[PDB]
Amino acid sequence: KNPKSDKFKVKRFHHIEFWCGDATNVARRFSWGLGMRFSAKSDLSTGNMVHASYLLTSGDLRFLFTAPYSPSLSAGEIKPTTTASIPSFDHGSCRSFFSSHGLGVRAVAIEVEDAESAFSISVANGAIPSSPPIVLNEAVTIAEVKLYGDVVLRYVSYKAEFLPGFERVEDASSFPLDYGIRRLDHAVGNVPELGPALTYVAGFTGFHQFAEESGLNSAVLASNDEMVLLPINEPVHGTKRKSQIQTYLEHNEGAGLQHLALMSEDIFRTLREMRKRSSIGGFDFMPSPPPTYYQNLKKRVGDVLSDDQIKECEELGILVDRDDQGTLLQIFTKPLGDRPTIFIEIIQRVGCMMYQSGGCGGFGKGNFSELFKSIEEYEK
Amino acid sequence: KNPKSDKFKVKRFHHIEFWCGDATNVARRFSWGLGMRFSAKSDLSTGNMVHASYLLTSGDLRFLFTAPYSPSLSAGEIKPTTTASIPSFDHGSCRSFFSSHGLGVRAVAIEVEDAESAFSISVANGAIPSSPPIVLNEAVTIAEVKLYGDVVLRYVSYKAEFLPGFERVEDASSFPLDYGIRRLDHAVGNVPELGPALTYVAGFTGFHQFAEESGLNSAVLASNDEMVLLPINEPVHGTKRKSQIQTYLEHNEGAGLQHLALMSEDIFRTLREMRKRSSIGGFDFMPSPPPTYYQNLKKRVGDVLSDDQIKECEELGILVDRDDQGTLLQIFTKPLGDRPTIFIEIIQRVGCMMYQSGGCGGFGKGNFSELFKSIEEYEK
Ligand SMILES: Cc1c(C(=O)C2=C(O)CCCC2=O)ccc2c1C(=O)N(Cc1ccc(C(F)(F)F)cc1)CC(=O)N2C
Ligand SMILES: Cc1c(C(=O)C2=C(O)CCCC2=O)ccc2c1C(=O)N(Cc1ccc(C(F)(F)F)cc1)CC(=O)N2C
Ligand SMILES: [Co+2]
Numbered sequence: 001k002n003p004k005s006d007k008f009k010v011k012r013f014h015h016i017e018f019w020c021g022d023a024t025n026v027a028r029r030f031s032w033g034l035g036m037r038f039s040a041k042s043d044l045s046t047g048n049m050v051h052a053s054y055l056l057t058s059g060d061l062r063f064l065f066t067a068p069y070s071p072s073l074s075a076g077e078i079k080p081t082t083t084a085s086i087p088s089f090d091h092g093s094c095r096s097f098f099s100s101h102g103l104g105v106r107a108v109a110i111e112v113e114d115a116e117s118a119f120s121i122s123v124a125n126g127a128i129p130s131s132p133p134i135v136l137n138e139a140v141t142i143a144e145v146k147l148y149g150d151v152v153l154r155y156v157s158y159k160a161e162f163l164p165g166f167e168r169v170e171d172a173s174s175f176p177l178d179y180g181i182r183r184l185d186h187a188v189g190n191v192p193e194l195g196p197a198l199t200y201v202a203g204f205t206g207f208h209q210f211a212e213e214s215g216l217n218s219a220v221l222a223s224n225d226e227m228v229l230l231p232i233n234e235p236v237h238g239t240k241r242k243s244q245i246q247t248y249l250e251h252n253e254g255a256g257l258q259h260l261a262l263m264s265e266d267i268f269r270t271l272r273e274m275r276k277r278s279s280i281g282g283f284d285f286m287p288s289p290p291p292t293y294y295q296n297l298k299k300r301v302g303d304v305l306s307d308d309q310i311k312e313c314e315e316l317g318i319l320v321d322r323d324d325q326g327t328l329l330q331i332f333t334k335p336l337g338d339r340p341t342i343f344i345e346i347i348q349r350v351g352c353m354m355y356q357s358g359g360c361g362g363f364g365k366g367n368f369s370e371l372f373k374s375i376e377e378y379e380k
Numbered sequence: 381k382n383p384k385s386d387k388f389k390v391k392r393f394h395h396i397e398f399w400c401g402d403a404t405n406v407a408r409r410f411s412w413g414l415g416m417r418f419s420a421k422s423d424l425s426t427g428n429m430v431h432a433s434y435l436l437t438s439g440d441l442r443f444l445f446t447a448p449y450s451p452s453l454s455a456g457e458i459k460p461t462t463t464a465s466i467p468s469f470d471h472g473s474c475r476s477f478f479s480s481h482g483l484g485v486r487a488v489a490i491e492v493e494d495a496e497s498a499f500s501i502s503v504a505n506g507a508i509p510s511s512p513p514i515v516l517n518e519a520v521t522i523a524e525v526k527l528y529g530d531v532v533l534r535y536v537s538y539k540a541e542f543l544p545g546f547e548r549v550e551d552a553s554s555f556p557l558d559y560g561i562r563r564l565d566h567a568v569g570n571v572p573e574l575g576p577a578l579t580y581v582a583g584f585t586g587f588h589q590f591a592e593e594s595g596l597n598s599a600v601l602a603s604n605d606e607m608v609l610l611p612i613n614e615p616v617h618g619t620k621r622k623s624q625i626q627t628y629l630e631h632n633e634g635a636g637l638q639h640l641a642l643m644s645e646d647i648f649r650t651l652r653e654m655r656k657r658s659s660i661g662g663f664d665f666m667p668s669p670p671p672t673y674y675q676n677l678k679k680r681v682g683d684v685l686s687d688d689q690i691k692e693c694e695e696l697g698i699l700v701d702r703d704d705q706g707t708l709l710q711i712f713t714k715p716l717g718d719r720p721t722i723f724i725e726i727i728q729r730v731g732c733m734m735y736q737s738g739g740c741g742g743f744g745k746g747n748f749s750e751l752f753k754s755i756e757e758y759e760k
């Protein structure tokens with residue numbers, strides 16, 4: 001059931017902002033590893049004396065990487081005279097975030113009809129404000145509320161690129177990489193206590209719960225058309241193997257964003273291209289399932305995937321799960337940086353055609369059991 | 381003249397250590413951009429709860445990238461019980477370094493006969509101690525003194541890999557990249573005042589001055605066999621164009637390492653390979669000289685380089701300078717990270733055969749004049 005209870009008009013995921021120590025090196029690594037092109041910048045060369053911010057895009061997916069300059073460059077500025085292009089940025093907040101959590105997501109940004117109204121309604125309904133609505137060049141409004149940990153939910157609304165004060169990137173440094181990634185499917189938080197986290201976020205958004213022994217409990221919040229999807233996990237303590245959610249919270253110094261799931265238009269091509277680059281600057285993937293997992297795929301999805309398509313999943317280490325509505329192909333990277341905290345998921349969904357409805361096939365929760373069983377069977 | 385006045389036995393450059401916010405992303409970017417292989421690690425997977433450190437190698441060149449974990453992982457440790465593999469590491473020092481200077485070189489490490497003796501003699505002769513000699517697994521001794529700014533000169537000595545507590549990297553993640561870089565030729569500091577910097581460093585090492593209108597004054601300190609080369613620059617103020625040394629000091633928050641010069645066995649292949657990767661995760665190069673510069677090469681080095689070899693320099697943007705002893709091919713990257721501070725030089729030297737003596741052909745100081753003249757001529 002979908003009660004369509006959003007308290008303001010939400011459109012789509014807009015961008016994800018990483019707070020970094022050095023934005024240049026993270027952005028270049030991510031660009032090569034994920035096949036995202038450099039699309040926009042705001043830095044010293046554009047008159048920004050406060051922060052360096054680089055935008056990568058692939059389809060509709062937008063990854064922003066931001067780091068502070070020396071405060072001495074902007075010491076004479078005040079907020080009314082700032083050269084920052086993102087007015088919510090603060091040197092001390094950014095350094096404190098990074099020192100506490102390491103490399104990770106500061107902002108999950110969604111596009112809304114009216115960022116000022118979304119902010120006001122959110123705070124009226126319990127959201128903890130983080131940055132008030134600020135209108136940029138009479139063209140874009142941006143506002144921020146706390147989501148979980150030190151992650152903010154950022155509202156952006158457009159009267160009619162990316163943000164005022166960003167410049168389009170010179171063609172020569174804009175190499176048109178593309179491994180097939182097209183949009184952000186969902187963004188997932190880890191928290192110590194799921195209940196209070198859900199109540200808080202659903203309280204101020206009106207997002208509804210989307211319909212759904214090893215590590216976690218989780219629930220998913222969704223916008224009216226279920227295209228903005230925000231799962232949240234909590235640990236399940238005193239287990240046989242240690243909870244990966246608890247490990248996250250230990251190494252992250254508390255709650256934060258756990259993973260970003262990136263939809264591909266062709267998950268086979270995306271994984272071929274990403275895996276070719278794992279050991280030359282790109283991303284590594286989690287250890288692949290045993291061959292028993294792929295033999296068991298025939299009985300589970302043999303009506304969705306051909307034998308060749310199942311063998312292609314096996315070559316690439318792709319996992320498969322299935323709803324009553326549709327089927328999910330997914331795979332997980334190793335952690336994106338030094339700490340065993342944030343990672344990326346690549347996904348593609350099949351079914352639920354009307355356009356494809358959001359969350360078709362679920363989130364792969366069946367693959368916890370299915371992986372465990374396949375490895376026990378492979379021990380044989 | 382070389383008075384061979386080293387106060388202790390110095391062998392060669394050993395490694396360069398970058399202090400990072402996230403060592404993983406910097407190391408992966410550098411590996412792809414420079415063609416260096418992952419050779420060793422010390423991190424959570426090796427029992428290090430303090431710092432993540434990744435070693436890249438190309439020939440004899442060794443680049444170490446280090447970042448701190450959450451102090452909470454090691455809160456119960458004391459120095460006698462530390463799990464750090466580099467005992468001089470300190471969470472607060474590293475975060476303060478990075479917040480102040482951004483991504484850059486913390487340690488210029490040279491191999492010596494006896495790191496404890498080099499440390500004692502250095503401090504007896506005016507060196508400011510930074511980390512005392514510490515013997516690692518009865519096998520390697522490491523000690524540190526201040527060089528300039530927050531950069532340390534690190535002494536390492538071996539009784540008989542890399543460091544105890546580092547593990548050799550699993551083959552699969554060790555892709556054998558190689559664009560031809562073979563060793564560190566020189567490492568260059570920027571300081572506000574050259575005189576006091578020279579007197580200090582030459583005072584405690586016994587390094588001698590190596591024989592040599594636009595931005596700087598500089599001098600070069602050299603070990604007995606002139607294979608350890610440490611140039612130092614100061615700004616020249618009140619100039620037509622602004623001093624690049626002064627710009628460095630402003631954006632770096634004071635003195636620090638300006639550039640690393642990396643010798644290639646085949647600078648043509650290195651630059652072909654690096655330039656292919658500039659816009660897909662690698663490094664960019666400074667704007668190339670005008671064609672007049674390459675026409676002027678015939679009169680300057682036409683007895684060293686063929687016309688084809690001169691045309692190959694032109695295709696790759698390589699600069700050329702010449703001593704009375706030998707000839708230098710060189711080129712400079714754009715800054716390695718967000719700030720206009722540290723960059724890399726790629727070099728190859730021709731002449732001075734006996735092995736090749738250190739510093740053959742100089743450091744390219746003639747290319748300041750030669751670049752200016754060529755651009756004025758190209759304005760035509
Ligand atoms: C996160 C995740 C999802 C997932 O998408 C999801 C939602 O979207 C919302 C509902 C709840 C949820 O879990 C689905 C399947 C899944 C994992 C998973 O996390 N794992 C471990 C794992 C550990 C450590 C690391 C790293 F080392 F990188 F930190 C990466 C993956 C292992 C594994 O076997 N299955 C099958
Ligand atoms: C550093 C340097 C050397 C050099 O090697 C050297 C020694 O080894 C010791 C003696 C003194 C010294 O200078 C040699 C030639 C040279 C430069 C040079 O720096 N430049 C500018 C330049 C600005 C900014 C940036 C960056 F934006 F990346 F910060 C990179 C290069 C411009 C240029 O035209 N010539 C010709
Ligand atoms: Co997921």
Ligand SMILES: [Co+2]
Nearest residue numbers: 568641725743
């Ligand atoms: Co140089």
